[PDB]
Design a protein around this ligand. Sequence first.
Ligand SMILES: [Zn+2]
Length: 30
Amino acid sequence: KTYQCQYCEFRSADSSNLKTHIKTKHSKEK
Ligand SMILES: [Zn+2]
């Protein structure tokens, strides 16, 4: 299988680029 994002519809078959995704796209610096 693949992985999914729990914010948007970002389902990638990578972890290194899914966790970074979450950080740089949902939980950045606020
Ligand atoms: Zn996302």
